[PDB]
Amino acid sequence: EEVETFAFQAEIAQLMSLIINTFYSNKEIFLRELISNSSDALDKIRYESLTDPSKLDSGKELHINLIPNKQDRTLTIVDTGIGMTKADLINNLGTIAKSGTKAFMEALQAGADISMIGQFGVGFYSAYLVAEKVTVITKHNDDEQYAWESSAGGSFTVRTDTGEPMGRGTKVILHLKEDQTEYLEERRIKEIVKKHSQFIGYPITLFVEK
Ligand SMILES: Nc1ncnc2[nH]cnc12
């Protein structure tokens, strides 16, 4: 029931402020970037399992689920990948985000655009193109289940998660901005997945709603 609050490193705070406040119409790349992250996490537990099959005792299925919820105005990306320890979460969700931001902003001045964010290892933060808040629920074999959350503004929280047990993996819950609800529509998500993620090597299931 204890919540810890952390400050973002200055460079990540600046990155998030850039993504939040730059005029950039091609916001759909956020989903490509989150699906790519999930794919990398699934590769990692698969790789670990090749020499230690017990790594899959927490779940043998390796997949990515996309879950829109119009009532909550949320779009959730679920994977059964390696997941993240508490230390991984605090360390910028397993990324080298300080140095990657630096490389990304230097690329932006030399004629790169925001869609190239994933080449600098910080594509997670493109979530803020379309979300006002992001909640990440995660479970790694070596640690307990945790919830990370941030509405930008310079800080994030970490707490033990009491929700439904996940087994192993990561859920990225996007609390969408009011003018970005097109990403809850079935036909729009399908369009984006077919365009940017057609060759991902894991089944991607787009859930539907009542
Ligand atoms: N889906 C994911 N799995 C593991 N680490 C991550 N860091 C960011 N997204 C992640």
mmCIF file of C-alpha atoms and ligand atoms in Angstrom:
data_model
loop_
_atom_site.group_PDB
_atom_site.id
_atom_site.type_symbol
_atom_site.label_atom_id
_atom_site.label_comp_id
_atom_site.label_asym_id
_atom_site.label_seq_id
_atom_site.Cartn_x
_atom_site.Cartn_y
_atom_site.Cartn_z
ATOM 1 C CA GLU A 1 0.000 0.000 0.000
ATOM 2 C CA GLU A 2 3.112 2.216 0.008
ATOM 3 C CA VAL A 3 3.755 4.476 -2.990
ATOM 4 C CA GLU A 4 7.218 5.801 -3.769
ATOM 5 C CA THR A 5 7.655 8.957 -5.881
ATOM 6 C CA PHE A 6 10.732 9.602 -8.019
ATOM 7 C CA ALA A 7 11.986 12.524 -10.117
ATOM 8 C CA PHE A 8 12.798 11.951 -13.769
ATOM 9 C CA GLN A 9 16.338 12.692 -14.768
ATOM 10 C CA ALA A 10 16.474 16.140 -16.346
ATOM 11 C CA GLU A 11 17.017 14.830 -19.877
ATOM 12 C CA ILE A 12 13.987 12.513 -19.694
ATOM 13 C CA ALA A 13 11.844 15.323 -18.261
ATOM 14 C CA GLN A 14 12.916 17.458 -21.233
ATOM 15 C CA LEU A 15 12.220 14.625 -23.706
ATOM 16 C CA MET A 16 8.739 14.123 -22.305
ATOM 17 C CA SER A 17 8.029 17.840 -22.428
ATOM 18 C CA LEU A 18 9.153 17.917 -26.079
ATOM 19 C CA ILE A 19 6.871 15.014 -27.031
ATOM 20 C CA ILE A 20 3.947 16.571 -25.159
ATOM 21 C CA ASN A 21 4.287 20.061 -26.628
ATOM 22 C CA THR A 22 5.757 19.770 -30.140
ATOM 23 C CA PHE A 23 3.332 20.122 -33.031
ATOM 24 C CA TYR A 24 3.595 16.755 -34.805
ATOM 25 C CA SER A 25 0.652 15.226 -36.675
ATOM 26 C CA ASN A 26 2.014 11.665 -37.243
ATOM 27 C CA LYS A 27 1.104 10.490 -33.713
ATOM 28 C CA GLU A 28 0.193 6.936 -34.797
ATOM 29 C CA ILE A 29 3.823 5.790 -34.584
ATOM 30 C CA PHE A 30 3.348 5.461 -30.814
ATOM 31 C CA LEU A 31 1.729 2.037 -31.356
ATOM 32 C CA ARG A 32 4.514 0.786 -33.603
ATOM 33 C CA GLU A 33 7.018 1.749 -30.903
ATOM 34 C CA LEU A 34 5.146 0.037 -28.058
ATOM 35 C CA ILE A 35 4.630 -3.140 -30.112
ATOM 36 C CA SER A 36 8.318 -3.135 -30.964
ATOM 37 C CA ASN A 37 9.195 -2.880 -27.269
ATOM 38 C CA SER A 38 6.931 -5.846 -26.496
ATOM 39 C CA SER A 39 8.526 -7.861 -29.297
ATOM 40 C CA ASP A 40 11.994 -7.194 -27.834
ATOM 41 C CA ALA A 41 10.842 -8.325 -24.379
ATOM 42 C CA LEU A 42 9.383 -11.522 -25.819
ATOM 43 C CA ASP A 43 12.653 -12.248 -27.649
ATOM 44 C CA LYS A 44 14.485 -11.832 -24.331
ATOM 45 C CA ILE A 45 12.497 -14.383 -22.333
ATOM 46 C CA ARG A 46 12.542 -16.733 -25.301
ATOM 47 C CA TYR A 47 16.341 -16.415 -25.387
ATOM 48 C CA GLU A 48 16.648 -17.038 -21.654
ATOM 49 C CA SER A 49 14.359 -20.068 -21.918
ATOM 50 C CA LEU A 50 16.580 -21.762 -24.519
ATOM 51 C CA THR A 51 19.032 -22.807 -21.785
ATOM 52 C CA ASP A 52 16.608 -22.791 -18.812
ATOM 53 C CA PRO A 53 13.097 -23.907 -19.807
ATOM 54 C CA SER A 54 11.867 -23.271 -16.262
ATOM 55 C CA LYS A 55 11.904 -19.568 -17.178
ATOM 56 C CA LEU A 56 8.551 -20.309 -18.860
ATOM 57 C CA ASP A 57 6.967 -21.800 -15.721
ATOM 58 C CA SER A 58 5.287 -18.384 -15.363
ATOM 59 C CA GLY A 59 3.664 -18.880 -18.778
ATOM 60 C CA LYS A 60 4.550 -20.578 -22.073
ATOM 61 C CA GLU A 61 2.454 -18.402 -24.395
ATOM 62 C CA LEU A 62 4.398 -15.581 -26.083
ATOM 63 C CA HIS A 63 2.011 -12.985 -27.521
ATOM 64 C CA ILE A 64 0.911 -9.330 -27.714
ATOM 65 C CA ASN A 65 -2.659 -8.169 -27.003
ATOM 66 C CA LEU A 66 -4.186 -4.789 -27.878
ATOM 67 C CA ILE A 67 -7.183 -3.900 -25.691
ATOM 68 C CA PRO A 68 -9.259 -0.741 -26.311
ATOM 69 C CA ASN A 69 -11.743 0.409 -23.658
ATOM 70 C CA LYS A 70 -13.923 3.318 -24.740
ATOM 71 C CA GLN A 71 -15.618 3.620 -21.336
ATOM 72 C CA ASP A 72 -12.284 4.185 -19.580
ATOM 73 C CA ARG A 73 -10.759 5.911 -22.628
ATOM 74 C CA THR A 74 -7.771 3.591 -22.423
ATOM 75 C CA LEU A 75 -5.711 1.624 -24.929
ATOM 76 C CA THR A 76 -3.660 -1.177 -23.344
ATOM 77 C CA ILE A 77 -0.718 -3.081 -24.863
ATOM 78 C CA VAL A 78 -0.064 -6.411 -23.124
ATOM 79 C CA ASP A 79 2.837 -8.772 -23.682
ATOM 80 C CA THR A 80 4.062 -11.943 -21.961
ATOM 81 C CA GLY A 81 7.720 -10.945 -22.328
ATOM 82 C CA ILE A 82 10.517 -10.851 -19.778
ATOM 83 C CA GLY A 83 8.896 -8.098 -17.749
ATOM 84 C CA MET A 84 10.759 -5.611 -15.556
ATOM 85 C CA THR A 85 12.132 -5.773 -12.021
ATOM 86 C CA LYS A 86 11.595 -2.849 -9.653
ATOM 87 C CA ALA A 87 15.144 -1.688 -10.417
ATOM 88 C CA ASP A 88 14.442 -1.874 -14.148
ATOM 89 C CA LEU A 89 11.295 0.234 -13.721
ATOM 90 C CA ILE A 90 13.118 2.925 -11.751
ATOM 91 C CA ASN A 91 15.967 2.893 -14.269
ATOM 92 C CA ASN A 92 13.743 4.371 -17.001
ATOM 93 C CA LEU A 93 11.857 1.146 -17.730
ATOM 94 C CA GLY A 94 14.948 -0.813 -18.704
ATOM 95 C CA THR A 95 16.269 1.804 -21.141
ATOM 96 C CA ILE A 96 19.414 3.896 -21.498
ATOM 97 C CA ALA A 97 17.112 6.885 -21.679
ATOM 98 C CA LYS A 98 19.572 9.575 -20.567
ATOM 99 C CA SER A 99 22.087 8.921 -23.342
ATOM 100 C CA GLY A 100 19.350 8.003 -25.814
ATOM 101 C CA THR A 101 17.582 11.304 -25.311
ATOM 102 C CA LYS A 102 20.890 13.073 -25.906
ATOM 103 C CA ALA A 103 21.419 11.232 -29.188
ATOM 104 C CA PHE A 104 17.772 11.805 -30.219
ATOM 105 C CA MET A 105 17.810 15.559 -29.658
ATOM 106 C CA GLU A 106 21.095 15.887 -31.545
ATOM 107 C CA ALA A 107 19.499 13.899 -34.361
ATOM 108 C CA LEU A 108 16.483 16.218 -34.331
ATOM 109 C CA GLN A 109 18.700 19.254 -34.958
ATOM 110 C CA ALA A 110 20.540 17.447 -37.791
ATOM 111 C CA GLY A 111 17.328 16.794 -39.766
ATOM 112 C CA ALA A 112 15.560 13.831 -38.172
ATOM 113 C CA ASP A 113 11.908 13.710 -37.214
ATOM 114 C CA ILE A 114 10.082 12.467 -34.123
ATOM 115 C CA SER A 115 9.103 9.213 -35.864
ATOM 116 C CA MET A 116 12.746 8.089 -35.588
ATOM 117 C CA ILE A 117 12.513 8.059 -31.778
ATOM 118 C CA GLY A 118 12.809 4.282 -31.586
ATOM 119 C CA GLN A 119 16.234 4.267 -33.206
ATOM 120 C CA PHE A 120 17.502 5.991 -30.018
ATOM 121 C CA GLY A 121 16.119 3.449 -27.559
ATOM 122 C CA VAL A 122 13.417 5.690 -26.035
ATOM 123 C CA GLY A 123 10.387 4.837 -28.110
ATOM 124 C CA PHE A 124 8.405 4.088 -24.928
ATOM 125 C CA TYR A 125 8.049 7.830 -24.375
ATOM 126 C CA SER A 126 6.191 8.314 -27.678
ATOM 127 C CA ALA A 127 3.195 7.085 -25.612
ATOM 128 C CA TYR A 128 2.832 10.738 -24.580
ATOM 129 C CA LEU A 129 2.010 11.768 -28.141
ATOM 130 C CA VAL A 130 -1.489 10.407 -27.459
ATOM 131 C CA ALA A 131 -1.729 9.800 -23.663
ATOM 132 C CA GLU A 132 -2.104 12.231 -20.756
ATOM 133 C CA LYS A 133 -1.070 9.496 -18.291
ATOM 134 C CA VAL A 134 0.616 6.102 -18.629
ATOM 135 C CA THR A 135 0.377 3.194 -16.156
ATOM 136 C CA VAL A 136 2.763 0.244 -16.602
ATOM 137 C CA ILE A 137 2.022 -3.016 -14.759
ATOM 138 C CA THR A 138 4.908 -5.493 -14.916
ATOM 139 C CA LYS A 139 6.069 -8.838 -13.530
ATOM 140 C CA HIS A 140 9.549 -10.337 -13.919
ATOM 141 C CA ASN A 141 10.448 -13.863 -12.779
ATOM 142 C CA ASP A 142 12.959 -12.475 -10.259
ATOM 143 C CA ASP A 143 10.697 -9.893 -8.573
ATOM 144 C CA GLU A 144 7.171 -9.022 -7.427
ATOM 145 C CA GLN A 145 4.428 -7.378 -9.506
ATOM 146 C CA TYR A 146 4.747 -3.567 -9.649
ATOM 147 C CA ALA A 147 2.813 -0.587 -11.006
ATOM 148 C CA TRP A 148 4.605 2.494 -12.452
ATOM 149 C CA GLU A 149 2.676 5.616 -13.358
ATOM 150 C CA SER A 150 3.309 9.108 -14.643
ATOM 151 C CA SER A 151 1.317 12.044 -16.012
ATOM 152 C CA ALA A 152 4.589 13.765 -16.974
ATOM 153 C CA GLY A 153 5.157 16.871 -14.925
ATOM 154 C CA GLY A 154 8.580 15.681 -13.803
ATOM 155 C CA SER A 155 7.840 12.643 -11.591
ATOM 156 C CA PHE A 156 6.694 9.008 -11.637
ATOM 157 C CA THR A 157 5.477 6.635 -8.924
ATOM 158 C CA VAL A 158 6.201 2.978 -8.195
ATOM 159 C CA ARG A 159 4.062 0.740 -5.984
ATOM 160 C CA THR A 160 3.430 -2.943 -5.450
ATOM 161 C CA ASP A 161 0.460 -3.934 -7.561
ATOM 162 C CA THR A 162 -2.486 -5.705 -5.933
ATOM 163 C CA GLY A 163 -4.399 -6.156 -9.194
ATOM 164 C CA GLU A 164 -5.008 -9.362 -11.113
ATOM 165 C CA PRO A 165 -1.766 -11.394 -11.168
ATOM 166 C CA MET A 166 -0.117 -11.378 -14.569
ATOM 167 C CA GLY A 167 2.163 -14.389 -14.442
ATOM 168 C CA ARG A 168 4.962 -12.695 -16.403
ATOM 169 C CA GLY A 169 5.157 -9.672 -18.705
ATOM 170 C CA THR A 170 4.144 -6.012 -19.059
ATOM 171 C CA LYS A 171 0.908 -4.049 -19.526
ATOM 172 C CA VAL A 172 1.170 -0.467 -20.852
ATOM 173 C CA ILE A 173 -2.123 1.329 -20.117
ATOM 174 C CA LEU A 174 -2.536 4.558 -22.161
ATOM 175 C CA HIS A 175 -4.992 7.066 -20.641
ATOM 176 C CA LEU A 176 -5.751 8.874 -23.879
ATOM 177 C CA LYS A 177 -6.010 12.607 -24.430
ATOM 178 C CA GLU A 178 -9.544 13.740 -25.224
ATOM 179 C CA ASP A 179 -8.766 14.521 -28.876
ATOM 180 C CA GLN A 180 -6.963 11.207 -29.478
ATOM 181 C CA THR A 181 -9.838 8.743 -29.120
ATOM 182 C CA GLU A 182 -9.469 7.592 -32.728
ATOM 183 C CA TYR A 183 -6.964 5.071 -31.347
ATOM 184 C CA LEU A 184 -9.823 3.253 -29.611
ATOM 185 C CA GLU A 185 -11.535 2.460 -32.935
ATOM 186 C CA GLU A 186 -11.082 -1.076 -34.265
ATOM 187 C CA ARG A 187 -10.549 -0.045 -37.862
ATOM 188 C CA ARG A 188 -7.915 2.548 -36.923
ATOM 189 C CA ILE A 189 -5.858 0.134 -34.807
ATOM 190 C CA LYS A 190 -5.983 -2.501 -37.548
ATOM 191 C CA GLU A 191 -4.870 0.101 -40.100
ATOM 192 C CA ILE A 192 -1.871 1.102 -37.960
ATOM 193 C CA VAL A 193 -0.829 -2.490 -37.170
ATOM 194 C CA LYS A 194 -1.016 -3.572 -40.831
ATOM 195 C CA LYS A 195 1.044 -0.525 -41.861
ATOM 196 C CA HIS A 196 3.831 -0.611 -39.251
ATOM 197 C CA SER A 197 3.881 -4.021 -37.556
ATOM 198 C CA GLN A 198 2.975 -6.549 -40.227
ATOM 199 C CA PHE A 199 6.186 -8.560 -39.752
ATOM 200 C CA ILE A 200 6.301 -8.801 -35.931
ATOM 201 C CA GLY A 201 7.126 -12.391 -35.046
ATOM 202 C CA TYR A 202 4.469 -12.900 -32.370
ATOM 203 C CA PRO A 203 0.668 -13.090 -32.644
ATOM 204 C CA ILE A 204 -0.981 -9.685 -32.164
ATOM 205 C CA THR A 205 -4.623 -9.998 -31.073
ATOM 206 C CA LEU A 206 -6.864 -6.932 -31.265
ATOM 207 C CA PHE A 207 -9.599 -7.315 -28.646
ATOM 208 C CA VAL A 208 -13.110 -6.042 -29.374
ATOM 209 C CA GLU A 209 -15.672 -4.440 -27.080
ATOM 210 C CA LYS A 210 -19.327 -4.913 -26.159
HETATM 211 N N1 LIG B 1 7.131 -4.094 -22.827
HETATM 212 C C1 LIG B 1 8.243 -3.943 -22.125
HETATM 213 N N2 LIG B 1 8.811 -5.021 -21.535
HETATM 214 C C2 LIG B 1 9.945 -4.862 -20.838
HETATM 215 N N3 LIG B 1 10.638 -3.746 -20.613
HETATM 216 C C3 LIG B 1 10.042 -2.690 -21.189
HETATM 217 N N4 LIG B 1 10.453 -1.355 -21.153
HETATM 218 C C4 LIG B 1 9.517 -0.670 -21.883
HETATM 219 N N5 LIG B 1 8.550 -1.429 -22.367
HETATM 220 C C5 LIG B 1 8.872 -2.701 -21.942
#
